[PDB]
Amino acid sequence: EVQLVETGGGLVQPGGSLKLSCRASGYTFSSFAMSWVRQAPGKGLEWVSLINDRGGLTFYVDSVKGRFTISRDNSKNTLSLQMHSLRDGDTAVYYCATGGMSSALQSSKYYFDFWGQGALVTV
Amino acid sequence: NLWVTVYYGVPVWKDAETTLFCASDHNVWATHACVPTDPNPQEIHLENVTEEFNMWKNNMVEQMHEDIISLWDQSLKPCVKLTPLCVTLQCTNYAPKLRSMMRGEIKNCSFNMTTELRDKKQKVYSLFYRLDVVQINKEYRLINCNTSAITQACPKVSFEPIPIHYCAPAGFAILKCKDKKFNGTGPCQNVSTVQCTHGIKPVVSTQLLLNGSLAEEEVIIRSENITNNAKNILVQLNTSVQINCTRPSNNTVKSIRIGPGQAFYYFGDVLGHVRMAHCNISKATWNETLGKVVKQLRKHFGNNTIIRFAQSSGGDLEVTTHSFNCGGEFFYCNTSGLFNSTWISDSLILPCWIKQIINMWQRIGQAMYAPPIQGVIRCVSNITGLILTRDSTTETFRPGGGDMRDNWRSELYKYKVVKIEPLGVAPTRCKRR
Amino acid sequence: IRSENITNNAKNILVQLNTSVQINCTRPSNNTVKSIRIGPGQAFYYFG
Amino acid sequence: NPQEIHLENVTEEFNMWKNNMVEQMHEDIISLWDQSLKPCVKLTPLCV
Amino acid sequence: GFLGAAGSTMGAASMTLTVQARNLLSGIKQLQARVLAVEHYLRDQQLLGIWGCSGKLICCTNVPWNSSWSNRNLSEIWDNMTWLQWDKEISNYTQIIYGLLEESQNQQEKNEQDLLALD
Amino acid sequence: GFLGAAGSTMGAASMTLTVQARNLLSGIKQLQARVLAVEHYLRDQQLLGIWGCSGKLICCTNVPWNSSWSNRNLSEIWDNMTWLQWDKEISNYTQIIYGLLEESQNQQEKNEQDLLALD
Amino acid sequence: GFLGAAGSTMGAASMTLTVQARNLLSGIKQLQARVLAVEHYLRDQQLLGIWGCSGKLICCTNVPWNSSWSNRNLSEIWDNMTWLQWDKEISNYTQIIYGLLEESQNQQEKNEQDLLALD
Ligand SMILES: *[C@@H]1O[C@H](CO)[C@@H](O[C@@H]2O[C@H](CO)[C@@H](O[C@@H]3O[C@H](CO)[C@@H](O)[C@H](O)[C@@H]3O)[C@H](O)[C@H]2NC(C)=O)[C@H](O)[C@H]1NC(C)=O
Ligand SMILES: *[C@@H]1O[C@H](CO)[C@@H](O[C@@H]2O[C@H](CO)[C@@H](O)[C@H](O)[C@H]2NC(C)=O)[C@H](O)[C@H]1NC(C)=O
Ligand SMILES: *[C@@H]1O[C@H](CO)[C@@H](O[C@@H]2O[C@H](CO)[C@@H](O)[C@H](O)[C@H]2NC(C)=O)[C@H](O)[C@H]1NC(C)=O
Ligand SMILES: *[C@@H]1O[C@H](CO)[C@@H](O[C@@H]2O[C@H](CO)[C@@H](O)[C@H](O)[C@H]2NC(C)=O)[C@H](O)[C@H]1NC(C)=O
Ligand SMILES: *[C@@H]1O[C@H](CO)[C@@H](O)[C@H](O)[C@H]1NC(C)=O
Ligand SMILES: *[C@@H]1O[C@H](CO)[C@@H](O)[C@H](O)[C@H]1NC(C)=O
Ligand SMILES: *[C@@H]1O[C@H](CO)[C@@H](O)[C@H](O)[C@H]1NC(C)=O
Ligand SMILES: *[C@@H]1O[C@H](CO)[C@@H](O)[C@H](O)[C@H]1NC(C)=O
Ligand SMILES: *[C@@H]1O[C@H](CO)[C@@H](O)[C@H](O)[C@H]1NC(C)=O
Ligand SMILES: *[C@@H]1O[C@H](CO)[C@@H](O)[C@H](O)[C@H]1NC(C)=O
Ligand SMILES: *[C@@H]1O[C@H](CO)[C@@H](O)[C@H](O)[C@H]1NC(C)=O
Ligand SMILES: *[C@@H]1O[C@H](CO)[C@@H](O)[C@H](O)[C@H]1NC(C)=O
Ligand SMILES: *[C@@H]1O[C@H](CO)[C@@H](O)[C@H](O)[C@H]1NC(C)=O
Ligand SMILES: *[C@@H]1O[C@H](CO)[C@@H](O)[C@H](O)[C@H]1NC(C)=O
Ligand SMILES: *[C@@H]1O[C@H](CO)[C@@H](O)[C@H](O)[C@H]1NC(C)=O
Ligand SMILES: *[C@@H]1O[C@H](CO)[C@@H](O)[C@H](O)[C@H]1NC(C)=O
Ligand SMILES: *[C@@H]1O[C@H](CO)[C@@H](O)[C@H](O)[C@H]1NC(C)=O
Ligand SMILES: *[C@@H]1O[C@H](CO)[C@@H](O)[C@H](O)[C@H]1NC(C)=O
Ligand SMILES: *[C@@H]1O[C@H](CO)[C@@H](O)[C@H](O)[C@H]1NC(C)=O
Ligand SMILES: *[C@@H]1O[C@H](CO)[C@@H](O)[C@H](O)[C@H]1NC(C)=O
Ligand SMILES: *[C@@H]1O[C@H](CO)[C@@H](O)[C@H](O)[C@H]1NC(C)=O
Ligand SMILES: *[C@@H]1O[C@H](CO)[C@@H](O)[C@H](O)[C@H]1NC(C)=O
Ligand SMILES: *[C@@H]1O[C@H](CO)[C@@H](O)[C@H](O)[C@H]1NC(C)=O
């Protein structure tokens, strides 16, 4: 019913930076909160970040709280994540997902409703 | 799992009755106490809003009527009182040998009155219209000396209607219908919000509605209860018919002093021939206007009925004739030449009478004397609506009228005033702290 | 019995009763009233 | 005892001929004048 | 525009509250009308103050929704209904809700007072 | 003293705000004057409320200074200028600043509402 | 009931503050009376605002009790005294207390401003 596609780079050096971006189609982008979830090549997946539908509020997992910036553009229907100081512990496939929050006047979620296929970021 | 959230500034309202304030962009209905209007009012269209209107329960009409009466009395208050005019008059007919329709209409009356000094009297000769003088040289009295005091209107204050805007006080809003073919009641689909109404001229007339607004597409027939013979029917035309009305006589006005700081103005002489006041209404335009009215009446009374128009059946001259004021003179036009027809499935001249003693607003006990106007009077007005009343196979309609509130309704039918209730509550997922 | 100053002869004493006493007061005459006009919009009423 | 507060380092621009206190003074004096004369004897009968 | 959102759904309409808030305040009869408008404004501000909402246009509280007042889904109330329809539905329970809000704020103020008393 | 700091620099003048705040509120024409004074007071309090400043005399906000409105140094504005000169300089941009303050508060209230929604 | 707690002790009486708060606001002479009632209401709300109490009925402050104003025990004041007796006792010191409250709030607002300045 919907499409969400990750764009991003590959191998970086430790201490550098990389911006990832996802494009959404098939649903109103501005009506849903968006999150980033990552899975290390040999581990399960974990939550990385959450942005509200308007984009004013952002939340991060502690392991990345001081480096990552999450931003969305509701006119372009895109979600961006700017990562800095990519560490070896940060190597993973990063998925964009629709869900994880609602703006007070909508039914609650606390789940990830739609998923993309994932950008693979290595160090 | 939901909690009450309090919202202030909710765009919700309820019907309310409040005091609206005049606004304007020397005149009887003008004052320095009336706030200037905005150079450009802001109208906010309300999409997907269907407000229910009722023009006959509108509290803006009573406010309009009361404020117009108040302005009227305020304008006449600082003027010359005519108490000394209630004297015995010795009168003869003016131009008693004249062949005309106006044979005996103007009487040449003589009276003593008084003057600046209380010990002396100044004999006065003046002309009065027959309708202002009642028999009691023959002895006559002014028609109003048996009913009320007469106050002279100030000659320096114009009676020309000036547009008056009504503006809601803060916390209230006025909803303007703007729908087409709106009969004055029920839901309106094109409702918009304004702070001030359009300018409404305080035009005073009976039987016919002059200088009003027009229907956008069709003649609109409005009645509180179309099946109740005790209610008036207000007809708003989509096109106007021009009425050119005049007092062709070249009247000369004279004045005398009647006390310290007081002067009395009266009708002195007629220059040239004495001519009858009258109105010019094009016959073809009027006939088409009534044809349109008849079609719209048939829509409510049946396609196969016969609609008849007839002259007013009786009552005071104010209701049996078309009363109006133009040029500073008060005309009472017969109109029997307009409302005389039966509808089954050159210009017209209406005789008019002029009166100087006017008893406006149906108030008995406060009379006003209209000073005569120097020269020849010609006025051109637009007839934009009609007032009709009705009495089987044939339905007969008559001019009716006389209740001034209905004239205000002819302009205020599209406005409603509401109170804003900015507080409201709604469930949300938000828990305090 | 209420008074601003009961010992001051210049003050009034107001006495509020616990029970009322009925007073039936009348003007037994059958008076006929007549009226005349004295000016425009004015009339004077008098005992006829 | 009115309290006057001196304003140091303030240079206000004045214009006595554009002062709206003058019109208020004039209108209020006229109003008081008419209010004082209103409840008094009229001399209309003196014009003899 | 003033009341431009009146026909808009509750969700979208809640984004323009400052327009109406600003417009609410902005002869003897006219002076009475102005005094009455001021009194009504102050009654609404006092009522918000009593509930602990004196400085907010969107004020969250601790009063639970009973669901008997209205059992509509949250998405139905905010995405499909207008504020006029909602007010028509809740007017029967408005005084109950206001009473609960006043009691809740009184309890909150006493609880904060006691927390502040702890040294 | 009332307005005693009017000729004083902005920094020192900001220490006496309560004197003017108290003084602002403390025939038919006089009654109209009193009603108008009340309406003006309420308009200023409502405007502070819209910005989320209903209970403060010195209220900090989230609106950045553009520097085009005035590019003076902070020490020049607070230590050398008076409030009258400052108002004369900013009056051309006052409505812009007020609009930004209203928008910022609306965004803040929506953000707080969403943070409160998180359980 | 309005003023029903007037003869009740201060402790129990403090639980009904919203009843009086709501009742305080709820010819030319009558219009003057209404305007005066509004002005008095606003003077009290302004005074609470100056002290930083604009949104509360029970507002805690940072001004210490001198004990010279009244040296009664806390249980004597709240469990044995009524609000009328207390007001009769404190009216001689009310202006002193109000002045201290205003100064304390001015100091608090400056301190919060400086804490907000730290980045
Ligand atoms: C309906 O509207 C028309 C047009 O606004 C009114 O006609 C106008 O009436 C006024 C007053 O009678 C005329 O003003 C007079 O003009 C003469 C010109 O010589 C002047 O000497 C007078 O002192 C006065 O200013 C105005 O000219 C006239 N307009 C036209 C085009 O004739 C009409 O009276 C209105 N109908 C009603 C019932 O009020
Ligand atoms: C009203 O009638 C009187 C006479 O009854 C008019 O006054 C007379 O006018 C003629 C000229 O037409 C004179 O010769 C007489 O001497 C006048 N008599 C008096 C007593 O004045 C008077 O002019 C008439 N009024 C008007 C307006 O024409
Ligand atoms: C009322 O209608 C008559 C015509 O029936 C108008 O009289 C004509 O007026 C024009 C223009 O002045 C003249 O050229 C014609 O010769 C007139 N005809 C006659 C028979 O007199 C009259 O002017 C109209 N009344 C008004 C006030 O306009
Ligand atoms: C006041 O007195 C006059 C007479 O001085 C009364 O009028 C007379 O009444 C008698 C009948 O009782 C008649 O026969 C006389 O002709 C009347 N005279 C006049 C001049 O009218 C008058 O009725 C008395 N008033 C009242 C109220 O009785
Ligand atoms: C005016 O008064 C005198 C008084 O002597 C009288 O003779 C005359 O007939 C009166 N005229 C009129 C018209 O009343
Ligand atoms: C005089 O006044 C009365 C009052 O009812 C009225 O009936 C009568 O018709 C009036 N006279 C004239 C001539 O109009
Ligand atoms: C409402 O009136 C305006 C007038 O300009 C018009 O443009 C609009 O189409 C009308 N709307 C409806 C639904 O009739
Ligand atoms: C007025 O209504 C009639 C009804 O038949 C119509 O023919 C005419 O065109 C309308 N005029 C306008 C200006 O709407
Ligand atoms: C006015 O029009 C409405 C349309 O719904 C109708 O219900 C009502 O009866 C009409 N009233 C009159 C007096 O024509
Ligand atoms: C109109 O008046 C008649 C009088 O008998 C009444 O029966 C009818 O119900 C009225 N119509 C309305 C709509 O009230
Ligand atoms: C009316 O008579 C006066 C007399 O001076 C004259 O000046 C004026 O032009 C006349 N007007 C008409 C319309 O005859
Ligand atoms: C009214 O005056 C105008 C002036 O041009 C004229 O064309 C029109 O025919 C007049 N009305 C009548 C009914 O004659
Ligand atoms: C109007 O003219 C007709 C002509 O028959 C007449 O009967 C009627 O009484 C006149 N109107 C008035 C008010 O006199
Ligand atoms: C009368 O209607 C015509 C229609 O074109 C208009 O031009 C004229 O201004 C109107 N006059 C008045 C007084 O409304
Ligand atoms: C009223 O009664 C009180 C009772 O304490 C008494 O002290 C006072 O003097 C009395 N006054 C009068 C006028 O009786
Ligand atoms: C009453 O008046 C007398 C007058 O001499 C005075 O001595 C007395 O003290 C007054 N009583 C009161 C209670 O004031
Ligand atoms: C007073 O006299 C009148 C005369 O018509 C009479 O009708 C009335 O009943 C009388 N009343 C008494 C109490 O005698
Ligand atoms: C009115 O309803 C339509 C339905 O799609 C909606 O698009 C429009 O925005 C609504 N009007 C307003 C002012 O929201
Ligand atoms: C909801 O309202 C009903 C009727 O007033 C009441 O019986 C019920 O206890 C209420 N429930 C809650 C949770 O307030
Ligand atoms: C006026 O300027 C002088 C300049 O040194 C300054 O000392 C003084 O305090 C200023 N006045 C006020 C009221 O601050
Ligand atoms: C400052 O104002 C100018 C002119 O209005 C505008 O172009 C610019 O974007 C503004 N900058 C900021 C940061 O608001
Ligand atoms: C009055 O005092 C008694 C003393 O025991 C107390 O019980 C009662 O509650 C008090 N009245 C009120 C209204 O508190
Ligand atoms: C208490 O008040 C007295 C008298 O005003 C004063 O001398 C003393 O310093 C005050 N103490 C405190 C702690 O404010």
PDB file of N, CA and C in Angstrom, chain B residues 16-66:
ATOM      1  N   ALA B  16     -27.337  34.982  20.347  1.00  0.00           N
ATOM      2  CA  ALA B  16     -27.314  35.957  21.428  1.00  0.00           C
ATOM      3  C   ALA B  16     -27.984  37.249  20.996  1.00  0.00           C
ATOM      4  N   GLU B  17     -28.462  37.986  21.995  1.00  0.00           N
ATOM      5  CA  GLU B  17     -29.093  39.290  21.832  1.00  0.00           C
ATOM      6  C   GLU B  17     -28.213  40.314  22.536  1.00  0.00           C
ATOM      7  N   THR B  18     -27.572  41.196  21.768  1.00  0.00           N
ATOM      8  CA  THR B  18     -26.679  42.199  22.335  1.00  0.00           C
ATOM      9  C   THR B  18     -26.947  43.546  21.684  1.00  0.00           C
ATOM     10  N   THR B  19     -26.201  44.550  22.138  1.00  0.00           N
ATOM     11  CA  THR B  19     -26.287  45.908  21.621  1.00  0.00           C
ATOM     12  C   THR B  19     -25.212  46.120  20.564  1.00  0.00           C
ATOM     13  N   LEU B  20     -25.636  46.489  19.361  1.00  0.00           N
ATOM     14  CA  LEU B  20     -24.736  46.758  18.253  1.00  0.00           C
ATOM     15  C   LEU B  20     -24.520  48.262  18.198  1.00  0.00           C
ATOM     16  N   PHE B  21     -23.336  48.664  17.723  1.00  0.00           N
ATOM     17  CA  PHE B  21     -22.990  50.109  17.703  1.00  0.00           C
ATOM     18  C   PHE B  21     -22.996  50.647  16.268  1.00  0.00           C
ATOM     19  N   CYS B  22     -23.558  51.845  16.072  1.00  0.00           N
ATOM     20  CA  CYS B  22     -23.600  52.451  14.756  1.00  0.00           C
ATOM     21  C   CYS B  22     -22.190  52.770  14.284  1.00  0.00           C
ATOM     22  N   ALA B  23     -22.046  52.878  12.973  1.00  0.00           N
ATOM     23  CA  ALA B  23     -20.826  53.382  12.378  1.00  0.00           C
ATOM     24  C   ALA B  23     -21.219  54.083  11.087  1.00  0.00           C
ATOM     25  N   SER B  24     -20.380  55.020  10.650  1.00  0.00           N
ATOM     26  CA  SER B  24     -20.638  55.770   9.431  1.00  0.00           C
ATOM     27  C   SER B  24     -19.323  56.056   8.723  1.00  0.00           C
ATOM     28  N   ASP B  25     -19.372  56.051   7.396  1.00  0.00           N
ATOM     29  CA  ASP B  25     -18.202  56.368   6.590  1.00  0.00           C
ATOM     30  C   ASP B  25     -18.058  57.884   6.503  1.00  0.00           C
ATOM     31  N   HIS B  26     -25.483  69.090   8.322  1.00  0.00           N
ATOM     32  CA  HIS B  26     -25.881  68.223   9.425  1.00  0.00           C
ATOM     33  C   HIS B  26     -27.025  67.320   8.979  1.00  0.00           C
ATOM     34  N   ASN B  27     -26.975  66.057   9.399  1.00  0.00           N
ATOM     35  CA  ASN B  27     -27.951  65.042   9.023  1.00  0.00           C
ATOM     36  C   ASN B  27     -28.623  64.478  10.267  1.00  0.00           C
ATOM     37  N   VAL B  28     -29.911  64.146  10.132  1.00  0.00           N
ATOM     38  CA  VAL B  28     -30.682  63.603  11.250  1.00  0.00           C
ATOM     39  C   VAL B  28     -30.023  62.353  11.820  1.00  0.00           C
ATOM     40  N   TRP B  29     -29.492  61.479  10.959  1.00  0.00           N
ATOM     41  CA  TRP B  29     -28.963  60.200  11.417  1.00  0.00           C
ATOM     42  C   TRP B  29     -27.440  60.178  11.482  1.00  0.00           C
ATOM     43  N   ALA B  30     -26.798  61.344  11.493  1.00  0.00           N
ATOM     44  CA  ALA B  30     -25.353  61.457  11.596  1.00  0.00           C
ATOM     45  C   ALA B  30     -25.026  62.091  12.940  1.00  0.00           C
ATOM     46  N   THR B  31     -23.905  61.687  13.528  1.00  0.00           N
ATOM     47  CA  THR B  31     -23.481  62.316  14.769  1.00  0.00           C
ATOM     48  C   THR B  31     -21.985  62.116  14.957  1.00  0.00           C
ATOM     49  N   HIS B  32     -21.371  63.059  15.672  1.00  0.00           N
ATOM     50  CA  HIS B  32     -19.950  62.952  15.989  1.00  0.00           C
ATOM     51  C   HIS B  32     -19.688  61.847  17.006  1.00  0.00           C
ATOM     52  N   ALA B  33     -20.730  61.371  17.690  1.00  0.00           N
ATOM     53  CA  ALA B  33     -20.634  60.285  18.654  1.00  0.00           C
ATOM     54  C   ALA B  33     -20.653  58.909  18.002  1.00  0.00           C
ATOM     55  N   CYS B  34     -20.866  58.824  16.688  1.00  0.00           N
ATOM     56  CA  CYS B  34     -20.955  57.553  15.983  1.00  0.00           C
ATOM     57  C   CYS B  34     -19.586  57.295  15.357  1.00  0.00           C
ATOM     58  N   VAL B  35     -18.985  56.164  15.720  1.00  0.00           N
ATOM     59  CA  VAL B  35     -17.598  55.842  15.353  1.00  0.00           C
ATOM     60  C   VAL B  35     -17.423  55.755  13.836  1.00  0.00           C
ATOM     61  N   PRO B  36     -16.333  56.287  13.264  1.00  0.00           N
ATOM     62  CA  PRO B  36     -16.057  56.078  11.835  1.00  0.00           C
ATOM     63  C   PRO B  36     -15.880  54.604  11.498  1.00  0.00           C
ATOM     64  N   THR B  37     -16.290  54.226  10.287  1.00  0.00           N
ATOM     65  CA  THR B  37     -16.091  52.851   9.849  1.00  0.00           C
ATOM     66  C   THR B  37     -14.662  52.639   9.369  1.00  0.00           C
ATOM     67  N   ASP B  38     -14.281  51.367   9.292  1.00  0.00           N
ATOM     68  CA  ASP B  38     -13.008  51.005   8.700  1.00  0.00           C
ATOM     69  C   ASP B  38     -13.019  51.365   7.213  1.00  0.00           C
ATOM     70  N   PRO B  39     -11.877  51.760   6.639  1.00  0.00           N
ATOM     71  CA  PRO B  39     -11.862  52.009   5.188  1.00  0.00           C
ATOM     72  C   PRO B  39     -12.080  50.758   4.361  1.00  0.00           C
ATOM     73  N   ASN B  40     -11.847  49.572   4.923  1.00  0.00           N
ATOM     74  CA  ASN B  40     -12.013  48.313   4.197  1.00  0.00           C
ATOM     75  C   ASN B  40     -12.381  47.212   5.192  1.00  0.00           C
ATOM     76  N   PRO B  41     -13.663  46.844   5.303  1.00  0.00           N
ATOM     77  CA  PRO B  41     -14.017  45.797   6.266  1.00  0.00           C
ATOM     78  C   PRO B  41     -13.511  44.452   5.774  1.00  0.00           C
ATOM     79  N   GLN B  42     -13.201  43.567   6.721  1.00  0.00           N
ATOM     80  CA  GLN B  42     -12.728  42.225   6.403  1.00  0.00           C
ATOM     81  C   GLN B  42     -13.844  41.210   6.614  1.00  0.00           C
ATOM     82  N   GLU B  43     -14.222  40.538   5.531  1.00  0.00           N
ATOM     83  CA  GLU B  43     -15.246  39.503   5.522  1.00  0.00           C
ATOM     84  C   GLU B  43     -14.555  38.146   5.453  1.00  0.00           C
ATOM     85  N   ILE B  44     -14.860  37.263   6.403  1.00  0.00           N
ATOM     86  CA  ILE B  44     -14.261  35.931   6.459  1.00  0.00           C
ATOM     87  C   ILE B  44     -15.312  34.900   6.072  1.00  0.00           C
ATOM     88  N   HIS B  45     -15.123  34.255   4.922  1.00  0.00           N
ATOM     89  CA  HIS B  45     -16.075  33.251   4.470  1.00  0.00           C
ATOM     90  C   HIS B  45     -15.917  31.994   5.317  1.00  0.00           C
ATOM     91  N   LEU B  46     -17.038  31.395   5.726  1.00  0.00           N
ATOM     92  CA  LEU B  46     -17.017  30.187   6.554  1.00  0.00           C
ATOM     93  C   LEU B  46     -17.392  28.976   5.708  1.00  0.00           C
ATOM     94  N   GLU B  47     -16.398  28.183   5.326  1.00  0.00           N
ATOM     95  CA  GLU B  47     -16.659  27.015   4.502  1.00  0.00           C
ATOM     96  C   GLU B  47     -17.238  25.897   5.364  1.00  0.00           C
ATOM     97  N   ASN B  48     -18.180  25.140   4.803  1.00  0.00           N
ATOM     98  CA  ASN B  48     -18.818  24.007   5.486  1.00  0.00           C
ATOM     99  C   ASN B  48     -19.518  24.422   6.781  1.00  0.00           C
ATOM    100  N   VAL B  49     -20.138  25.600   6.789  1.00  0.00           N
ATOM    101  CA  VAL B  49     -20.918  26.091   7.926  1.00  0.00           C
ATOM    102  C   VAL B  49     -22.330  26.365   7.436  1.00  0.00           C
ATOM    103  N   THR B  50     -23.322  25.765   8.096  1.00  0.00           N
ATOM    104  CA  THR B  50     -24.727  25.932   7.719  1.00  0.00           C
ATOM    105  C   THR B  50     -25.529  26.469   8.901  1.00  0.00           C
ATOM    106  N   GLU B  51     -25.465  27.785   9.080  1.00  0.00           N
ATOM    107  CA  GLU B  51     -26.125  28.462  10.187  1.00  0.00           C
ATOM    108  C   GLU B  51     -27.611  28.583   9.873  1.00  0.00           C
ATOM    109  N   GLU B  52     -28.452  28.399  10.887  1.00  0.00           N
ATOM    110  CA  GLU B  52     -29.891  28.569  10.725  1.00  0.00           C
ATOM    111  C   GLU B  52     -30.286  30.002  11.062  1.00  0.00           C
ATOM    112  N   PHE B  53     -30.960  30.658  10.118  1.00  0.00           N
ATOM    113  CA  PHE B  53     -31.371  32.051  10.219  1.00  0.00           C
ATOM    114  C   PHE B  53     -32.881  32.150  10.376  1.00  0.00           C
ATOM    115  N   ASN B  54     -33.334  33.251  10.980  1.00  0.00           N
ATOM    116  CA  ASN B  54     -34.765  33.555  11.043  1.00  0.00           C
ATOM    117  C   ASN B  54     -34.898  35.075  11.106  1.00  0.00           C
ATOM    118  N   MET B  55     -35.267  35.689   9.977  1.00  0.00           N
ATOM    119  CA  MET B  55     -35.300  37.147   9.900  1.00  0.00           C
ATOM    120  C   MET B  55     -36.380  37.765  10.783  1.00  0.00           C
ATOM    121  N   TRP B  56     -37.380  36.994  11.226  1.00  0.00           N
ATOM    122  CA  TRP B  56     -38.480  37.550  12.007  1.00  0.00           C
ATOM    123  C   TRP B  56     -38.262  37.415  13.508  1.00  0.00           C
ATOM    124  N   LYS B  57     -37.144  36.821  13.926  1.00  0.00           N
ATOM    125  CA  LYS B  57     -36.777  36.657  15.326  1.00  0.00           C
ATOM    126  C   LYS B  57     -35.460  37.383  15.580  1.00  0.00           C
ATOM    127  N   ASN B  58     -35.015  38.175  14.603  1.00  0.00           N
ATOM    128  CA  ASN B  58     -33.744  38.879  14.608  1.00  0.00           C
ATOM    129  C   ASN B  58     -33.815  40.079  15.540  1.00  0.00           C
ATOM    130  N   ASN B  59     -32.888  40.165  16.486  1.00  0.00           N
ATOM    131  CA  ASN B  59     -32.906  41.256  17.447  1.00  0.00           C
ATOM    132  C   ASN B  59     -32.233  42.503  16.890  1.00  0.00           C
ATOM    133  N   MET B  60     -31.688  42.430  15.674  1.00  0.00           N
ATOM    134  CA  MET B  60     -31.049  43.577  15.054  1.00  0.00           C
ATOM    135  C   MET B  60     -32.096  44.558  14.550  1.00  0.00           C
ATOM    136  N   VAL B  61     -33.312  44.065  14.307  1.00  0.00           N
ATOM    137  CA  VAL B  61     -34.401  44.885  13.792  1.00  0.00           C
ATOM    138  C   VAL B  61     -34.898  45.827  14.876  1.00  0.00           C
ATOM    139  N   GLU B  62     -35.076  45.305  16.090  1.00  0.00           N
ATOM    140  CA  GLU B  62     -35.518  46.150  17.188  1.00  0.00           C
ATOM    141  C   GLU B  62     -34.450  47.178  17.518  1.00  0.00           C
ATOM    142  N   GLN B  63     -33.178  46.779  17.461  1.00  0.00           N
ATOM    143  CA  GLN B  63     -32.111  47.730  17.737  1.00  0.00           C
ATOM    144  C   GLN B  63     -32.093  48.819  16.670  1.00  0.00           C
ATOM    145  N   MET B  64     -32.311  48.436  15.406  1.00  0.00           N
ATOM    146  CA  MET B  64     -32.356  49.404  14.313  1.00  0.00           C
ATOM    147  C   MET B  64     -33.487  50.399  14.525  1.00  0.00           C
ATOM    148  N   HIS B  65     -34.668  49.883  14.868  1.00  0.00           N
ATOM    149  CA  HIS B  65     -35.853  50.717  15.023  1.00  0.00           C
ATOM    150  C   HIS B  65     -35.685  51.678  16.191  1.00  0.00           C
ATOM    151  N   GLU B  66     -35.265  51.153  17.344  1.00  0.00           N
ATOM    152  CA  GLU B  66     -35.087  51.989  18.522  1.00  0.00           C
ATOM    153  C   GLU B  66     -34.011  53.042  18.292  1.00  0.00           C
TER     154      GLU B  66
END
